[PDB]
Amino acid sequence: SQWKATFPVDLEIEKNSEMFALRYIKCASAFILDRRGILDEKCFKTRTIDKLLVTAFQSSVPAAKRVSSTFDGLRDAIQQGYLREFAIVFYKKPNEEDINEVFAFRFAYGDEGEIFVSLNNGIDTNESSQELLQAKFVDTDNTKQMFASTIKKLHRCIKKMEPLPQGSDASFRVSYTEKAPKDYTPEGYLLSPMFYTLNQDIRKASIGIVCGGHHKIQMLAASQYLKQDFPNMSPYGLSQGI
């Protein structure tokens, strides 16, 4: 039930920061997929982290194990400093380009100077990239607090959302840093020329940034099911694992 049962401490240390970063995006993903109703409810279990009720995959359920396992290959992607963004996109077949909703997790590595702002795809903006740049690691307890603050905001944001359309489809999509080789492909992902793009008018939410010592992870959302821009108290990659 304590932080330590889920996450590393001493987050200033590179290895602990790396492990935290991956475990964080897996945790938030379970939270999101459960609350937006993408998988059967038996795929999830409620766990406790300090004062907060969060969500984890139930790996004894095949669909949940499949989704959980997709994160395995991202461990090397993060270690090598290759993973720029991990995104959960919701859409309706057959139009995989028409994104109804996305939760994006954008990475910055060890006081990286500045990051390219994509002109033609994704969710990132000058504003969001400035916020990611200005975020700083402070100490482990502070990240415990910021984790809690960010999950609470995620929760409040999802509460403001209308339900997903019946039979929505979901994919995981990743983009890479300039370090990554030209045809880099994490284990469990497929190499793709396509990422995702959003309608100009889609409503957006900035949920928060959580920092390890060597990794900053920014959560940004956009949804056709938010009306307007926005208890749990105790060279791209594609995965269609969901």
TrEMBL record:
Cellular component GO terms held in the UniProt record: chromosome; condensed nuclear chromosome; lateral element; synaptonemal complex
Pfam families associated with the record: HORMA
Keyword terms: Chromosome, Meiosis, Nucleus
Molecular function per GO: DNA binding
Superkingdom as given in the UniProt entry: Eukaryota
Membrane-spanning parts: none
Coiled coil: none
Protein location: Chromosome; Nucleus
Location of the HORMA domain: 15-221
Main location: nucleus
GO biological process assignments: homologous chromosome pairing at meiosis; homologous chromosome segregation; meiotic chromosome segregation; reciprocal meiotic recombination; regulation of centriole-centriole cohesion; sister chromatid cohesion; synaptonemal complex assembly
SUPFAM superfamilies referenced in this protein's UniProt entry, alphabetically: The spindle assembly checkpoint protein mad2
PROSITE patterns recorded: HORMA
Protein name: HORMA domain-containing protein
Species this chain originates from: Caenorhabditis elegans
